[PDB]
Structure formats: C-alpha cells, structure tokens
Amino acid sequence: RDEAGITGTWYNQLGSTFIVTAGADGALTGTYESAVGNAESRYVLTGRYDSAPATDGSGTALGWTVAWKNNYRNAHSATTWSGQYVGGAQARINTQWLLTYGTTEANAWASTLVGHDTFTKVK
Amino acid sequence: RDEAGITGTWYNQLGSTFIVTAGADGALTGTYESAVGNAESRYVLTGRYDSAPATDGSGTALGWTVAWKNNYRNAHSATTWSGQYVGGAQARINTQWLLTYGTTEANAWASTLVGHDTFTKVK
Amino acid sequence: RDEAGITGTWYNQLGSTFIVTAGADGALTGTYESAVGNAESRYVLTGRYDSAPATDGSGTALGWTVAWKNNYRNAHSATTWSGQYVGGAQARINTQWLLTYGTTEANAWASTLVGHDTFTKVK
Amino acid sequence: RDEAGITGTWYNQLGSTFIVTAGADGALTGTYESAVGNAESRYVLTGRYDSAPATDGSGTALGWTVAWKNNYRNAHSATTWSGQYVGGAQARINTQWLLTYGTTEANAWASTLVGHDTFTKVK
Ligand SMILES: O=C(CCCC[C@@H]1SC[C@@H]2NC(=O)N[C@@H]21)NCCN(Cc1ccccn1)Cc1ccccn1
Ligand SMILES: O=C(CCCC[C@@H]1SC[C@@H]2NC(=O)N[C@@H]21)NCCN(Cc1ccccn1)Cc1ccccn1
Ligand SMILES: O=C(CCCC[C@@H]1SC[C@@H]2NC(=O)N[C@@H]21)NCCN(Cc1ccccn1)Cc1ccccn1
Ligand SMILES: O=C(CCCC[C@@H]1SC[C@@H]2NC(=O)N[C@@H]21)NCCN(Cc1ccccn1)Cc1ccccn1
Ligand SMILES: [Cu+2]
Ligand SMILES: [Cu+2]
Ligand SMILES: [Cu+2]
Ligand SMILES: [Cu+2]
C-alpha cells in the first residue's frame, strides 16, 4: 500500500513540518510544527488514510487534525487537513484545510478560515 | 474541562451518528456512521480538541477525520470536520467539513467537497 | 424559469438582507445588507444564475459577490456566495460563502473565511 | 487604484482564461473560459472589487461568479472565486473557489466543490 510512501517527514509551502506515521490499519499519528500563526514547537496530530486505495492511478485520500495547544502555547483553535497523497518521484500530499477557533455565538459566523497546503518530501 | 461535555453520542442534521471519547490529553477517538453517501455501518475516527479552552464564553475548538473504508465498503475518500463545541442545555458541535476523494491528477481540481454539519445530543 | 422565484428580498439566519433581481439572461443584480461584521447600510452585489435549470427536481445553481465598500465604510474585503435556489412553499437559497480580506503576502495563508448562509423569503 | 492592474487577461494553473474589466465603481465584468470540466468556449462573469484598497502593502479583495451556461453547453452549476489581487512585477490574483451544482434535496450535502486557483498575467 501507501503506508511506506506516506510515513515520514513532509514540508509545505509555508515552511511547516509534518511528521507522520501511517499504520497498517489506516491510522495517521505524528507531530506538526507550523512556520506561521499562533504556534510554537511541535503539536500532536492524528488522522486517517485509505489503506487500500484504487490501483487506477488515483491518489490516496487522507486527513488529519491538530489542536493548537501544547506545553508552550494555546491558540484555542484546531486545523483539519483533507487531501490526497500522490506517489512517485515528485511525491506530494495536496490538501485543503479548515482552521476553526473558539468564538462566542455572536462571532461564530467568522470562526473558520480555509486554505490549501501542498506537502513535499523536500524542503 | 469539556471532556465530559464532548464525550458521548452525537447526531447531525442528516441522521448520521458520531460516537466519541474525549481524552484528558486532547485526544478524540470513536466511530462515525453516515446516513448518506457511499457509507455503511461504522467507521473509525480520530481527532483532537482544545483541552484548556478559554473561559470567556467562547466555544471549544476541535476536529476529527474519517477515512471511508471499513470491513464492508471502501469509498476511496476521507472527510475532516473542523468546528467548535458549545456547551449548555442545547449543547452543540458546529462544524464545517472537507471530503476529499482519490482522483487522477487531471481530475484533482474536482477532488474536494465542502459542507457543514451541526451535531446535537438528541436525534 | 426561476427568474420570478429568485427575484425579490431574502433574509438569512444572521438577520442580513439580500435584495436581488434575476435577469432573463442569467444576471443577478441588487444590494446586500449584513447584520454582522464590518458593514453598514447597503452594498452593491452582482452575480449569475442558471437560467435554464434541470426539470428533474434539482435546485438552480447561482452565485454572487459583495465587495465591502460603500459610501460609509470600507472593510477591504469581499464575500462570494455559491449555492442553489430551491423553490416551493418553503423557498430557500442554500449557500456556502468565502470572505477574503486584503493581507500582506506573509499573512495571506489567513486571508479567507468560510461559512454557510441559508436565505428564506420570511425574516 | 488597481483598476489598471486588474483589467486585462489572466491565466490560472489549469490553463483557463479569465478576461476582466475593472470599473471605477468597483465593478468586474468579463468572460471566463475553463480548460477543465463541463465547459466549452466563453462564459459571462460578473463580480466586485475593493476600489479603494489599503496602501500598507495589503492585497486588493475581490470576487466574481460564472454560471456554467452559454449557447453551447449547460452544466447546471456556478462557481464563485474569492481572493485578492497582488500587484507588481509578478502580479497575481490568488483565489479560493466554490462550485455548486443543482441537486435534489437528498443529495444537497454533496452539492459544493471547493478549490483554489492562482491567476497570472502570463500563461
Ligand atoms: O494561528 C493559529 C494556530 C496556528 C495555525 C497555522 C496554520 S494551520 C493552516 C496553515 N498551514 C500551516 O502549516 N500553518 C497554517 N490559530 C489562530 C487562532 N486565533 C485566530 C487567528 C486568526 C488569524 C490569525 C491569528 N489568529 C484565535 C486566537 C486564540 C487565542 C490566541 C490568539 N488567537
Ligand atoms: O460518499 C462518500 C463517503 C461518505 C460521505 C458522507 C458525508 S461526510 C460529510 C457529510 N456528513 C455526514 O454525516 N455524511 C456526509 N465518499 C464519496 C466518494 N466518491 C465521490 C462521491 C462524491 C459525491 C457523491 C458520491 N460520491 C468517490 C467514490 C470512490 C469509490 C466509490 C464511489 N465513489
Ligand atoms: O466584516 C467584514 C465585512 C462584512 C462581512 C459580513 C459576512 S459575509 C458572510 C456572512 N453573511 C452575512 O450576511 N454576513 C456575514 N469583513 C471583515 C474584514 N476584516 C477581517 C475580519 C475578519 C473577522 C472579523 C472582522 N474582520 C479585515 C478588516 C479590514 C479593514 C477594517 C477591518 N477589518
Ligand atoms: O464542470 C462544471 C463547470 C466547469 C467547472 C470548471 C472549474 S471552476 C473551478 C476550476 N477553475 C477553473 O478554471 N476551472 C475549474 N460543472 C460541474 C457540474 N456537474 C458536477 C460535476 C462535478 C465534478 C465533475 C463533473 N461534474 C453537474 C453536471 C450537471 C449537468 C451536466 C453535467 N454535470
Ligand atoms: Cu489568533
Ligand atoms: Cu462516490
Ligand atoms: Cu475586520
Ligand atoms: Cu458534471
């Protein structure tokens, strides 16, 4: 499967570092370090991936979450990345993400940012 | 914290069932059953939540992922929900979500659906 | 078509007011007044809709944009709503939206909010 | 303002062509031709932009809509792009977009795709 291809250290276009282990069962576990935002050092992440993807040249669907609290900082927010892994010489994880931060109900309409990150195996 | 308030069974507006356990460390673990889509029975989920949220009336940021493969069905896709938990008599988890399915690179522009789910403690 | 059904005044769940005219050619023109945010009084809007939708019970795709500058206020931002009109006794426009605000390149990863608005013919 | 900088022909990463005129009043009008999807030849577009942006190095917020019906084809859908214009030697329009297609109410949870397009002045 893509277990071997996904497991390892990845980098996105902002300079962030995504260290992950793909389990045989479809589990993703690791750490995330963001180069931007209210973030410092490494944060726990967990997620899931398709462990038996199609064999027609389609990518491998996956997703993971980081809550932005660690021993150093708390940003009262969480980001989820949703995307697909694309193997080969230029292996990539192409994602879109949603960052929700805690708000009062009056401000909840403004609680969620959306963006896109592309992860590669080389900085 | 919100550990007690989050842990348990939740229902969204489509009839789906979200069974989760909030850990003291910020972990979310459980199962998801979707009332719609290429889905059948329960699927593994994992995620994260802010375990020390603000005490100013703001909600509690969280997120989780489901890869849509179980023993019965594989839909070559994954959904991430990003949102906040709002406690009280009418407790709610308000989310937006991203569903990515595996595609060829030529079709990757069309690989991601976006939506919103509101979860409540009563069906 | 849905020209008659779309044209008119609509209200969303925040209390905002969406006044629109659907043209025979697929044009949407009107004004938007937001009950929340850095907004005051009415703002110009323009958009487009499917003027020959399917007749199988599917909704009518449409979209529109507001730039958040008028004679009174400038919020250096723009929102686009994308959704479908659903006719009948409980007529609805169900949307998701993207709000982008002007940022420096260093902050561009955080420039876009995402949400969802449901518009009805009654307040 | 950015009227001169925005007006003209733009190209995104898929090969699509975005021809627009920025009006003094904040209007965007033009045509869109998509290199991908259920699309053929040019489609009408309309939108809005911030005509008095900040002068602190922030980008210029804007948005526009295309309904995917012309004389040749009807795809019962509409896309809205929301983003900012960034001037200079490497001028760019960075966007995220929402594509909604008409659906029955039972399938409405799956009606909206999300993505991101970067437009440049050179192919
Ligand atoms: O910045 C963060 C956490 C880090 C996000 C990095 C993102 S994840 C997507 C993208 N990909 C990356 O690799 N990095 C970035 N959360 C914002 C929470 N705050 C709102 C907010 C929104 C925009 C800008 C700054 N803040 C609210 C708040 C609560 C308490 C204190 C301060 N602020
Ligand atoms: O349907 C699913 C999995 C279940 C999603 C339920 C969602 S999660 C968000 C929302 N909230 C809920 O509680 N339920 C719904 N994935 C679609 C994957 N397929 C694309 C697709 C897109 C739209 C409609 C149907 N299919 C691709 C494909 C690969 C192989 C076979 C068949 N299809
Ligand atoms: O608030 C607005 C314009 C009004 C948005 C109302 C939305 S549209 C979606 C939803 N539906 C509705 O009917 N109403 C709401 N733009 C924020 C721009 N600012 C960022 C921002 C982000 C979050 C909260 C406040 N500001 C940046 C900025 C530039 C200069 C000065 C001040 N601020
Ligand atoms: O393809 C389109 C219109 C063209 C979209 C091009 C996008 S806009 C964002 C991105 N940026 C670009 O420059 N190009 C692309 N609409 C899909 C509507 N159909 C769903 C759909 C979803 C995914 C793939 C194909 N179809 C439904 C349907 C109704 C009737 C017949 C056939 N299909
Ligand atoms: Cu912040
Ligand atoms: Cu499917
Ligand atoms: Cu603001
Ligand atoms: Cu189609």
XYZ file of C-alpha atoms and ligand atoms in Angstrom:
628
model
C 0.000 0.000 0.000
C 0.979 3.639 0.536
C 1.983 3.047 4.163
C 5.678 3.285 3.271
C 5.129 6.216 0.917
C 3.193 8.318 3.415
C 5.218 7.628 6.562
C 7.979 10.156 7.100
C 8.630 13.891 7.242
C 6.840 16.319 4.919
C 7.157 20.058 4.306
C 4.604 22.526 2.979
C 4.955 25.831 1.102
C 4.980 27.920 4.297
C 7.948 26.057 5.790
C 5.858 23.939 8.186
C 6.943 20.394 9.167
C 4.550 17.426 9.156
C 5.978 14.241 10.680
C 3.656 11.271 10.334
C 3.442 7.501 10.668
C 0.920 5.583 8.577
C -0.347 2.466 10.309
C -1.366 -0.765 8.632
C -4.907 -0.167 9.970
C -5.290 3.249 8.332
C -4.100 5.296 11.305
C -2.086 8.500 10.997
C -0.107 9.639 14.039
C 2.631 12.209 14.397
C 3.549 15.815 15.108
C 3.003 19.128 13.327
C 5.114 22.265 13.503
C 3.716 25.407 11.857
C 6.010 28.065 10.477
C 3.204 30.657 10.774
C 0.444 31.665 13.165
C -0.010 31.414 16.919
C 2.154 28.314 17.069
C 5.421 27.227 18.621
C 7.374 23.940 18.517
C 5.559 20.642 17.838
C 1.877 19.735 18.260
C 0.174 16.352 18.404
C -1.686 15.209 15.286
C -3.894 12.243 14.477
C -5.756 11.231 11.353
C -6.784 8.510 8.930
C -5.979 7.347 5.402
C -7.344 4.914 2.798
C -5.192 1.809 3.358
C -6.494 0.004 0.234
C -6.680 2.748 -2.396
C -7.618 2.231 -6.006
C -4.932 0.980 -8.400
C -6.052 3.079 -11.386
C -3.632 5.966 -10.832
C -5.901 7.789 -8.363
C -4.409 9.395 -5.293
C -4.854 8.108 -1.746
C -7.444 10.002 0.334
C -6.430 11.041 3.857
C -6.937 13.621 6.600
C -5.578 14.747 9.953
C -6.187 17.224 12.789
C -4.035 19.433 15.007
C -5.397 21.200 18.086
C -3.167 24.206 18.675
C -2.327 23.560 22.306
C 0.965 22.204 23.577
C 3.080 22.787 26.670
C 4.207 26.215 25.383
C 1.187 27.851 23.759
C -2.573 27.596 23.388
C -4.260 29.245 20.414
C -7.793 27.972 21.191
C -8.145 26.571 17.680
C -7.842 23.443 15.568
C -6.951 22.785 11.914
C -8.022 19.810 9.817
C -6.298 18.943 6.555
C -8.148 16.915 3.929
C -6.423 15.761 0.768
C -4.748 13.017 -1.179
C -1.285 11.508 -1.349
C 0.243 11.215 -4.825
C 3.261 8.911 -5.032
C 6.230 8.796 -7.364
C 9.433 10.722 -7.915
C 7.750 14.036 -7.044
C 5.591 12.605 -4.245
C 3.033 15.062 -2.864
C 0.259 15.439 -0.329
C -2.180 18.016 -1.756
C -4.591 19.374 0.862
C -7.233 21.885 1.702
C -7.676 22.821 5.344
C -10.158 24.337 7.799
C -8.993 26.267 10.862
C -11.702 26.838 13.463
C -11.065 28.954 16.537
C -13.244 29.188 19.616
C -15.693 32.105 19.490
C -18.784 33.435 21.149
C -22.021 32.546 19.402
C -22.308 36.137 18.187
C -18.976 35.821 16.358
C -19.365 32.206 15.217
C -20.076 33.237 11.608
C -16.391 34.308 11.493
C -14.871 31.297 13.258
C -13.441 29.311 10.336
C -10.561 30.002 7.954
C -9.996 27.958 4.794
C -6.802 27.399 2.867
C -4.656 24.950 0.942
C -1.245 23.377 1.658
C 0.944 21.290 -0.629
C 3.370 18.963 1.145
C 6.546 17.590 -0.410
C 9.334 15.336 0.784
C 11.993 18.034 0.183
C 12.013 21.445 1.887
C -12.884 20.995 31.068
C -15.189 19.963 28.221
C -14.044 16.331 28.338
C -17.316 15.262 29.968
C -19.403 17.512 27.728
C -17.900 16.263 24.474
C -17.682 12.541 25.237
C -20.764 10.646 24.139
C -23.046 10.118 21.155
C -23.941 12.969 18.796
C -26.308 13.261 15.835
C -26.214 15.629 12.875
C -28.948 17.009 10.597
C -28.597 14.180 8.058
C -29.229 11.450 10.638
C -25.557 10.458 11.000
C -24.172 9.146 14.326
C -20.912 10.410 15.847
C -19.723 8.447 18.886
C -16.664 9.968 20.518
C -14.481 9.867 23.616
C -12.566 12.976 24.650
C -9.305 12.173 26.395
C -7.675 14.205 29.135
C -4.738 14.793 26.745
C -6.873 16.329 23.993
C -7.469 13.114 22.055
C -10.703 12.309 20.236
C -11.406 8.662 19.418
C -14.572 6.934 18.314
C -16.738 5.781 15.427
C -18.763 7.525 12.725
C -21.824 6.254 10.894
C -23.069 8.308 7.933
C -26.712 8.306 6.959
C -25.775 9.387 3.405
C -23.160 8.664 0.761
C -21.040 5.639 -0.089
C -21.049 4.501 3.519
C -22.264 1.554 5.544
C -22.134 0.744 9.280
C -19.438 2.308 11.496
C -16.049 3.793 10.562
C -13.031 4.590 12.711
C -12.448 8.244 13.603
C -9.680 10.109 15.388
C -9.163 13.766 16.167
C -8.110 16.439 18.633
C -9.689 19.123 20.812
C -8.607 22.113 22.921
C -8.424 20.626 26.434
C -7.931 24.022 28.146
C -10.317 26.335 26.293
C -10.951 29.944 27.162
C -13.391 30.711 29.984
C -14.915 33.812 28.360
C -17.915 32.065 26.795
C -16.037 31.012 23.644
C -16.597 27.572 22.199
C -14.060 24.746 22.300
C -12.150 24.189 19.034
C -11.871 20.606 17.766
C -11.566 18.423 14.671
C -11.663 14.815 13.519
C -11.188 12.604 10.448
C -12.917 9.562 8.968
C -11.421 7.531 6.123
C -14.322 5.844 4.364
C -13.027 2.292 4.455
C -14.251 -0.418 6.790
C -14.757 -4.165 6.502
C -17.872 -3.685 4.324
C -17.145 -0.809 1.949
C -14.373 1.388 0.597
C -15.245 4.770 -0.890
C -11.630 5.881 -1.524
C -12.218 9.132 0.348
C -11.820 10.881 3.682
C -13.770 13.621 5.490
C -12.415 16.038 8.082
C -14.710 18.029 10.348
C -13.477 21.271 11.898
C -15.586 23.179 14.389
C -16.331 24.094 17.958
C -18.243 22.552 20.833
C -20.771 24.813 22.564
C -21.971 23.542 25.941
C -25.161 24.090 27.889
C -28.755 22.932 27.759
C -28.761 22.941 23.942
C -25.202 21.619 23.584
C -23.904 21.640 20.006
C -20.902 20.814 17.869
C -20.990 23.208 14.889
C -18.711 22.106 12.042
C -17.615 22.637 8.506
C -16.143 19.679 6.657
C -13.961 18.751 3.681
C -14.441 15.474 1.813
C -11.554 14.553 -0.478
C -11.726 11.524 -2.743
C -8.857 9.933 -4.619
C -8.534 11.196 -8.199
C -6.154 11.265 -11.099
C -4.065 14.410 -11.352
C -6.173 15.528 -14.312
C -9.311 15.464 -12.145
C -7.725 16.725 -8.918
C -9.299 20.187 -9.292
C -12.635 18.431 -8.569
C -11.495 16.209 -5.695
C -12.863 18.076 -2.667
C -16.409 18.694 -1.446
C -17.208 21.198 1.306
C -20.166 21.292 3.645
C -21.400 21.948 7.159
C -22.850 19.665 9.863
C -24.456 20.605 13.167
C -24.328 17.911 15.844
C -26.704 17.709 18.796
C -27.139 15.337 21.704
C -30.732 14.476 20.675
C -31.693 12.914 17.332
C -37.772 29.668 -15.299
C -36.774 30.648 -11.759
C -36.451 34.337 -12.653
C -39.696 35.152 -10.833
C -38.877 32.852 -7.922
C -35.423 34.295 -7.292
C -36.159 37.996 -7.782
C -37.095 39.734 -4.556
C -35.940 40.219 -0.975
C -34.319 37.396 1.000
C -33.181 37.056 4.612
C -30.539 34.795 6.122
C -30.105 33.324 9.618
C -27.983 36.250 10.848
C -30.635 38.852 10.006
C -28.937 40.055 6.802
C -30.988 41.341 3.829
C -30.342 40.229 0.239
C -32.306 42.161 -2.390
C -31.847 40.778 -5.884
C -33.190 40.912 -9.427
C -32.781 37.894 -11.691
C -32.444 38.838 -15.341
C -33.671 36.822 -18.294
C -30.015 36.491 -19.395
C -28.844 34.918 -16.132
C -27.774 38.151 -14.446
C -28.132 38.815 -10.724
C -28.072 42.437 -9.566
C -29.040 44.004 -6.274
C -27.939 45.115 -2.823
C -26.735 43.339 0.314
C -27.015 44.480 3.913
C -25.141 42.450 6.541
C -26.377 42.261 10.099
C -22.851 41.355 11.289
C -19.245 42.321 10.640
C -17.540 45.495 9.465
C -20.595 46.513 7.479
C -23.129 49.314 7.439
C -26.191 50.009 5.256
C -26.416 48.542 1.731
C -23.655 47.297 -0.591
C -23.691 46.617 -4.319
C -23.878 42.979 -5.420
C -23.688 41.230 -8.772
C -23.819 37.587 -9.755
C -25.103 34.906 -12.098
C -27.624 32.061 -12.107
C -28.578 29.076 -14.284
C -31.467 30.458 -16.364
C -32.399 27.045 -17.844
C -32.063 24.651 -14.905
C -32.916 20.984 -14.986
C -36.568 19.978 -14.584
C -35.891 16.845 -12.511
C -36.385 18.455 -9.096
C -32.794 19.722 -8.840
C -32.125 23.166 -7.454
C -30.958 26.137 -9.515
C -27.225 26.914 -9.238
C -26.240 30.547 -8.639
C -23.645 32.843 -7.079
C -22.968 36.474 -6.234
C -20.300 38.808 -4.826
C -20.231 41.785 -2.468
C -17.167 43.994 -2.037
C -17.442 45.557 1.403
C -17.009 49.176 0.397
C -19.789 51.731 0.183
C -20.063 55.447 0.884
C -19.979 54.848 4.667
C -17.435 52.100 5.309
C -14.631 50.121 3.709
C -13.685 46.742 5.157
C -11.068 45.874 2.491
C -12.746 42.535 1.819
C -15.170 40.706 -0.442
C -17.588 37.796 0.063
C -18.823 35.383 -2.593
C -21.859 33.184 -2.036
C -22.252 29.975 -4.032
C -25.375 27.863 -3.753
C -28.685 26.789 -5.175
C -32.224 28.118 -5.163
C -34.933 25.652 -4.122
C -38.472 26.738 -4.989
C -41.835 25.933 -3.468
C -43.811 26.873 -0.389
C -40.661 26.987 1.764
C -38.452 28.535 -0.932
C -34.768 28.708 0.008
C -31.372 29.786 -1.243
C -28.813 27.488 0.430
C -25.252 28.818 0.184
C -21.685 28.469 1.251
C -19.513 31.570 1.171
C -15.888 32.724 1.073
C -14.814 36.026 2.626
C -11.360 37.194 1.560
C -9.770 40.279 3.074
C -6.711 42.102 1.811
C -3.495 40.977 3.517
C 0.238 41.147 3.181
C 1.809 38.145 1.496
C 3.142 36.997 4.866
C -0.410 36.799 6.242
C -2.111 35.533 3.076
C -2.472 31.996 4.474
C -5.045 33.521 6.880
C -6.916 35.714 4.393
C -10.071 33.671 3.759
C -13.028 32.798 5.981
C -15.596 30.162 5.013
C -19.180 29.812 6.137
C -22.735 28.969 5.158
C -25.919 31.071 4.908
C -29.491 29.928 4.345
C -31.796 32.538 2.820
C -35.577 32.499 3.129
C -38.368 34.745 1.929
C -39.584 35.417 5.504
C -37.456 37.025 8.228
C -6.170 52.402 -7.783
C -5.842 48.814 -9.011
C -8.312 49.349 -11.862
C -5.491 49.366 -14.420
C -3.675 46.484 -12.737
C -6.695 44.188 -12.611
C -8.202 44.898 -16.032
C -6.945 42.528 -18.697
C -6.470 38.837 -19.436
C -5.406 36.380 -16.729
C -4.494 32.689 -16.767
C -4.677 30.114 -13.990
C -2.728 26.899 -13.331
C -5.226 24.713 -15.217
C -4.910 26.705 -18.448
C -8.190 28.613 -18.002
C -8.608 32.184 -19.335
C -10.122 34.999 -17.256
C -10.775 38.214 -19.191
C -11.971 41.047 -16.981
C -12.596 44.784 -16.871
C -12.399 46.611 -13.550
C -14.729 49.587 -13.377
C -14.113 52.803 -11.487
C -17.165 51.947 -9.334
C -15.818 48.569 -8.207
C -17.483 46.503 -10.928
C -15.904 43.439 -12.522
C -17.240 42.326 -15.905
C -15.844 39.918 -18.451
C -15.697 36.353 -19.727
C -14.330 33.072 -18.380
C -13.101 30.065 -20.325
C -12.332 26.899 -18.345
C -9.745 24.432 -19.549
C -11.404 21.666 -17.482
C -14.865 20.414 -16.581
C -18.235 20.516 -18.310
C -17.335 23.736 -20.081
C -16.854 24.969 -23.618
C -15.874 28.371 -25.067
C -16.531 31.572 -23.079
C -18.999 32.239 -20.245
C -20.278 35.505 -18.810
C -18.814 36.632 -15.482
C -19.564 39.483 -13.108
C -18.088 40.480 -9.779
C -16.828 43.210 -7.478
C -13.534 44.534 -6.121
C -12.296 46.961 -3.450
C -11.742 50.172 -5.442
C -10.002 51.994 -2.551
C -7.765 49.330 -1.006
C -5.341 49.905 1.817
C -1.935 51.394 0.985
C 0.033 49.329 3.523
C 1.107 46.578 1.119
C -2.093 44.542 1.545
C -3.695 42.931 -1.467
C -6.953 44.074 -3.053
C -10.006 41.959 -2.145
C -12.285 40.870 -4.999
C -14.678 38.176 -6.206
C -16.617 37.028 -9.252
C -19.150 34.429 -10.425
C -19.642 32.284 -13.521
C -22.840 30.339 -14.185
C -21.895 27.458 -16.457
C -24.463 28.035 -19.172
C -23.751 29.548 -22.564
C -25.085 28.995 -26.070
C -23.182 25.686 -26.387
C -23.432 23.923 -23.031
C -25.249 23.959 -19.708
C -23.636 22.307 -16.695
C -26.335 23.336 -14.172
C -23.717 24.826 -11.861
C -21.993 28.034 -10.822
C -18.516 28.862 -9.481
C -17.565 31.833 -7.319
C -13.958 32.908 -6.880
C -12.948 34.903 -3.809
C -9.441 36.261 -3.419
C -7.062 39.165 -3.619
C -5.074 40.886 -6.335
C -1.364 41.384 -5.632
C 0.357 43.873 -7.934
C 3.941 44.244 -9.071
C 6.307 42.536 -11.469
C 4.847 39.100 -10.676
C 1.238 40.305 -10.421
C -1.186 37.654 -9.164
C -4.811 37.026 -8.311
C -4.842 34.353 -5.576
C -8.272 32.766 -5.102
C -10.293 30.073 -3.474
C -13.493 28.995 -5.187
C -16.819 27.252 -4.566
C -18.578 25.298 -7.314
C -22.210 24.479 -6.558
C -24.264 22.308 -8.882
C -28.013 21.841 -8.822
C -29.104 18.786 -6.823
C -32.125 17.217 -5.246
C -32.549 17.963 -1.560
C -31.487 14.403 -0.756
C -28.128 14.980 -2.468
C -27.625 18.600 -1.389
C -24.979 17.644 1.196
C -22.754 16.804 -1.817
C -23.544 19.844 -3.970
C -20.450 22.007 -3.442
C -16.827 21.570 -4.503
C -14.025 23.745 -3.126
C -10.678 24.561 -4.663
C -8.034 27.196 -5.273
C -6.811 28.951 -8.443
C -3.822 31.241 -8.897
C -4.071 33.653 -11.824
C -1.091 35.267 -13.529
C -0.652 37.646 -16.430
C 1.498 35.137 -18.376
C 0.310 31.680 -19.461
O -2.685 30.617 14.469
C -3.306 29.654 14.925
C -2.678 28.294 15.113
C -1.661 28.030 14.017
C -2.264 27.946 12.630
C -1.247 27.618 11.498
C -1.956 27.272 10.127
S -2.761 25.651 10.034
C -3.053 26.048 8.297
C -1.755 26.620 7.748
N -0.797 25.552 7.448
C 0.303 25.630 8.192
O 1.280 24.822 8.121
N 0.224 26.658 9.043
C -1.012 27.385 8.894
N -4.666 29.844 15.315
C -5.325 31.138 15.181
C -6.260 31.358 16.415
N -6.647 32.750 16.537
C -7.393 33.275 15.391
C -6.432 33.884 14.389
C -6.872 34.020 13.062
C -5.922 34.592 12.209
C -4.637 34.969 12.668
C -4.266 34.791 14.021
N -5.195 34.267 14.784
C -7.545 32.858 17.689
C -6.628 33.083 18.889
C -6.912 32.470 20.124
C -6.047 32.669 21.221
C -4.941 33.482 20.964
C -4.718 34.055 19.690
N -5.556 33.846 18.672
O -19.726 9.112 -0.011
C -18.582 9.047 0.445
C -18.292 8.602 1.857
C -19.403 9.052 2.788
C -19.522 10.556 2.916
C -20.618 11.040 3.910
C -20.522 12.589 4.214
S -19.155 13.105 5.287
C -19.900 14.748 5.215
C -21.396 14.566 5.418
N -21.713 14.373 6.836
C -22.246 13.179 7.082
O -22.604 12.772 8.230
N -22.322 12.458 5.958
C -21.827 13.186 4.818
N -17.488 9.381 -0.411
C -17.699 9.796 -1.792
C -16.565 9.187 -2.681
N -16.914 9.244 -4.086
C -17.124 10.597 -4.605
C -18.587 10.974 -4.479
C -18.911 12.341 -4.484
C -20.281 12.595 -4.364
C -21.226 11.550 -4.230
C -20.819 10.196 -4.224
N -19.527 10.008 -4.357
C -15.790 8.688 -4.842
C -16.057 7.186 -4.910
C -14.995 6.271 -4.789
C -15.258 4.884 -4.834
C -16.601 4.540 -4.991
C -17.615 5.520 -5.096
N -17.334 6.825 -5.049
O -16.656 42.108 8.224
C -16.396 42.229 7.024
C -17.427 42.645 6.004
C -18.791 42.098 6.384
C -18.872 40.586 6.362
C -20.278 40.004 6.692
C -20.381 38.455 6.391
S -20.469 37.989 4.642
C -20.727 36.307 5.245
C -21.745 36.390 6.373
N -23.105 36.518 5.843
C -23.679 37.668 6.183
O -24.853 38.015 5.847
N -22.838 38.419 6.902
C -21.574 37.760 7.110
N -15.056 41.990 6.591
C -14.008 41.607 7.529
C -12.676 42.313 7.112
N -11.707 42.280 8.190
C -11.313 40.934 8.611
C -12.214 40.465 9.736
C -12.308 39.081 9.963
C -13.159 38.740 11.019
C -13.863 39.721 11.758
C -13.722 41.096 11.462
N -12.900 41.367 10.475
C -10.486 42.927 7.704
C -10.672 44.412 8.012
C -10.232 45.386 7.096
C -10.427 46.755 7.383
C -11.071 47.022 8.592
C -11.493 45.985 9.456
N -11.294 44.698 9.155
O -17.759 21.227 -14.695
C -18.542 22.135 -14.408
C -18.429 23.524 -14.988
C -16.970 23.885 -15.203
C -16.167 23.977 -13.922
C -14.682 24.403 -14.114
C -13.967 24.748 -12.746
S -14.440 26.320 -11.977
C -13.146 25.962 -10.771
C -11.929 25.488 -11.553
N -11.210 26.621 -12.141
C -11.203 26.587 -13.470
O -10.647 27.455 -14.212
N -11.888 25.529 -13.917
C -12.413 24.733 -12.836
N -19.615 21.849 -13.510
C -19.794 20.522 -12.932
C -21.324 20.206 -12.860
N -21.557 18.791 -12.654
C -20.995 18.259 -11.411
C -19.593 17.741 -11.661
C -18.734 17.622 -10.555
C -17.463 17.137 -10.878
C -17.099 16.824 -12.210
C -18.019 16.981 -13.272
N -19.203 17.422 -12.917
C -23.005 18.591 -12.565
C -23.469 18.383 -14.005
C -24.686 18.938 -14.445
C -25.094 18.756 -15.783
C -24.213 18.021 -16.578
C -23.001 17.505 -16.065
N -22.642 17.695 -14.792
Cu -5.199 34.295 16.729
Cu -18.681 8.323 -4.832
Cu -12.136 43.115 10.098
Cu -20.809 17.331 -14.009
